[PDB]
Design a protein around this ligand. Structure first.
Ligand code: CLA
Ligand code: CLA
Ligand SMILES: CC1=C(/C=C/C(C)=C/C=C/C(C)=C/C=C/C=C(C)/C=C/C=C(C)/C=C/C2=C(C)CCCC2(C)C)C(C)(C)CCC1
Ligand SMILES: [Ca+2]
Lengths: 97, 56, 243, 56, 56
């Protein structure tokens, strides 16, 4: 009955891609042009029903939408996991080097 | 090493994986388990090995 | 008005601003304007814990406790929009602030009860037809209570949710079933309820004060044991301003 | 609970603990010094003083 | 932990039956139920072959 929800989440797309609804902000450093400007807007405007909903963030520039489109393939969405988003952990998850 | 040797010889004589491993005596397999290694104990961990991991 | 050096070390930093007895006025609400709470402060004075009922299934009461974590308990610098609704009611939507404190209280006999005293994501509303906020106004609302420890927290044996071992490594050949509840950390998220009773209003400044009562669960140690029910009583202060 | 001396303390008015409980089931009582613990401590100190007097 | 409540025993005819209580002298005691006038109405038999008062 008892499940570690973080381990479980590693078996979903969360474990394969940047989950726009859960993944810590540092992950956006993996690809050109996402950090810190887009990273901030994405985390601030989460959750999303689908990856393509990220294109609808209010105030995005035309260039930002293009960059987002180029990176949709690296993104996913799964259900919000309380354990990953509480504590401001998406902005600092206690991991440094 | 001896377990793997016996399994390979079984596989080479046309056994299935199930058959090859089923042919390994339990007694040989039990030697290949760290709970039977004498360098895994404690000075004040008293009594039979069975008192730790259990009766196999 | 006091400076940091006036306040430092006195215990005043953990108290909410108060209003004088003359402040029994009314603060006009204009349904055309936007409003905000610039500062909400909540200062607990009493923590009560519901006794775990013997087994009579009779009335289990909330009992007094002793605070052991000192003057570290208040919620403050909380802000958010104050909506005016169709029916003339007000809805405060908490957006940010110092909106949680870990608190440990001690029951008679020694049992320590940690809790995350909080109003995170508070949405609280008045009665309908609040043309002016008076000493008859009150707010009732719900808030979120996340796990007292967050996902990185490691127990004394190094086990955790987002980090740590996933077994009892000191008992290498123990049967794992009876240790599952200790080995598998779970993150709690529940709801709390709060009432704010306005007792004082400065009609000129838009400052209000009064008493609060809140109810929420205590720490469950990442799913290792059952939380306790806690009732928190205290005073509050809020400054309302046109947004 | 097999309590033997506790009832004798209770019989004469010692009913509370420093830890906040009372044998009548009250909470948040202050028994003052003469809790069950205070009584116990007083007897231990008396024991020590009588021991010293015995030596003299 | 808790009182289960007061048990009221009744036979098929709906008459209230009363379990005979164990006196302090007895380490073990039979189970005998009587009506309000002390007439035996039910018991737990030892020998079953000539039982007439079984709960069944
Ligand atoms: C050569 C000596 C020797 C050895 C190797 C064994 C070996 C064994 N015995 Mg046997 N046994 C022995 C002699 C020995 N025994 C003697 C003399 C008796 C009579 C008391 C027994 C009676 C006995 C019983 C009843 C049992 C065993 C059992 C066992 C097994 C578990 C041992 C254990 O848990 O140790 C634990 C060892 C320690 C905790 C180390 C002790 C260290 C001491 C206390 C240090 C003292 C320090 C000193 C005071 C410092 C002084 C400083 C000063 C100079 C300044 C193991 C196969 C158990 C078993 O499984 O049987 C089937 C069992 O139940 N033994
Ligand atoms: C210094 C004063 C003092 C005080 C205030 C206490 C107080 C207490 N003691 Mg401690 N105690 C003391 C000294 C004291 N003690 C000393 C010096 C000893 C060593 C002997 C003890 C050994 C002791 C024990 C073993 C116990 C206590 C216990 C207690 C508690 C219950 C008392 C009770 O039921 O008495 C009952 C006393 C009597 C019924 C006295 C009977 C008097 C006889 C009948 C007198 C007969 C002779 C007389 C001359 C006849 C003529 C009388 C005349 C008026 C006509 C209470 C907290 C109890 C407890 O709760 O422990 C934690 C307990 O078990 N005490
Ligand atoms: C009043 C009162 C009371 C009581 C009390 C009492 C009961 C007391 C007592 C007391 C006591 C009971 C005391 C004592 C003591 C003592 C002493 C003071 C001692 C001493 C000593 C010495 C000095 C010694 C020495 C030596 C040594 C050590 C060794 C060898 C040598 C020599 C000898 C040198 C009460 C609490 C109720 C309350 C209130 C009041
Ligand atoms: Ca009021």
């Amino acid at each position: 009955e008892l499940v570690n929800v973080v381990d479980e989440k590693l078996g979903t797309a969360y474990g394969e891609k940047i989950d726009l609804n859960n993944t810590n902000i540092a992950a956006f450093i993996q690809y050109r042009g996402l950090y810190p400007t887009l990273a901030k807007l994405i985390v601030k405007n989460a959750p999303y029903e689908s990856v393509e909903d990220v294109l609808n963030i209010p105030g995005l520039t035309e260039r930002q939408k293009q960059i987002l489109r180029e990176n949709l393939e690296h993104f996913t969405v799964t259900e919000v996991e309380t354990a990953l988003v509480e504590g401001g952990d998406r902005y600092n998850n206690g991991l440094y080097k | 090493q001896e377990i793997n040797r016996r399994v390979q010889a079984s596989l080479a004589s046309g056994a299935t994986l199930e058959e090859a491993w089923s042919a390994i005596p339990e007694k040989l397999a039990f030697y290949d388990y760290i709970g039977n290694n004498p360098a895994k104990g404690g000075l004040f961990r008293t009594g039979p090995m069975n008192k730790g991991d259990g009766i196999a | 008005t006091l400076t940091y050096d006036d306040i430092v070390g006195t215990g005043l930093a953990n108290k909410c601003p108060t209003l004088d007895d003359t402040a029994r006025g009314a603060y006009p609400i204009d349904s055309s304007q936007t409003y905000r709470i610039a500062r909400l402060c909540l200062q607990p004075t009493t923590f009560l814990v519901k006794e775990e009922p013997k087994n009579k299934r009779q009335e289990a009461e909330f009992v007094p406790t002793k605070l052991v974590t000192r003057e570290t308990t208040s919620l403050d610098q909380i802000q958010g929009e104050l909506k005016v609704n169709s029916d003339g009611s007000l809805t405060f939507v908490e957006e940010d602030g110092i909106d949680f404190q870990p608190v440990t209280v001690q029951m008679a006999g020694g049992e320590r009860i940690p809790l995350l005293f909080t109003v995170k994501n508070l949405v609280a509303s008045t009665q309908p037809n609040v043309t002016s906020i008076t000493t008859s106004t009150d707010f009732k609302g719900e808030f979120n209570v996340p796990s007292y420890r967050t996902a990185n927290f490691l127990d004394p044996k190094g086990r955790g949710l987002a980090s740590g071992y996933d077994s009892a490594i000191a008992l290498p050949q123990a049967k794992e079933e009876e240790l599952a509840r200790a080995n598998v950390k779970r993150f709690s998220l529940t709801k709390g309820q709060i009432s704010l009773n306005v007792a004082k209003v400065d009609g000129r400044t838009g400052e209000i004060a009064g008493t609060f009562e809140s109810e929420q669960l205590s720490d469950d140690d990442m799913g290792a044991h059952e939380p306790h029910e806690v009732k928190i009583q205290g005073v509050f202060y809020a400054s309302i301003e046109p947004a | 609970q097999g309590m033997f001396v506790l009832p004798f303390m209770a019989r004469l008015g010692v009913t509370g603990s420093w830890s906040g409980w009372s044998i009548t089931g009250e909470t948040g009582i202050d028994p003052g010094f003469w809790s069950f613990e205070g009584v116990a401590l007083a007897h231990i100190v008396l024991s020590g003083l009588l021991f010293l007097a015995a030596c003299w | 932990q808790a009182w289960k409540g007061h048990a009221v025993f009744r036979n098929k005819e709906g008459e209230e039956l009363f379990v005979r209580r164990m006196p302090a002298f007895f380490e073990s005691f039979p189970v005998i139920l009587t009506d309000k006038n002390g007439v035996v109405k039910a018991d737990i038999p030892f020998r079953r072959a000539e039982s007439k008062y079984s709960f069944e």
